[PDB]
Amino acid sequence: KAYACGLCNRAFTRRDLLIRHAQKIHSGNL
Ligand SMILES: [Zn+2]
Numbered sequence: 879k880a881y882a883c884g885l886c887n888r889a890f891t892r893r894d895l896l897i898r899h900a901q902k903i904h905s906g907n908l
Pocket of ligand 1: 904
C-alpha cells in the first residue's frame with residue numbers, strides 16, 4: 879500500500895524514504 883512503514887507507522891511520499899527508514903530506524907530487515 880501507500881509507502882507507509884507498518885512498523886513505526888510512518889509514511890513517506892517516496893519509497894527510498896521508506897527503505898532508508900528501515901535501514902535507519904529499524905536498521906535491519908533480515
Ligand atoms: Zn518504520
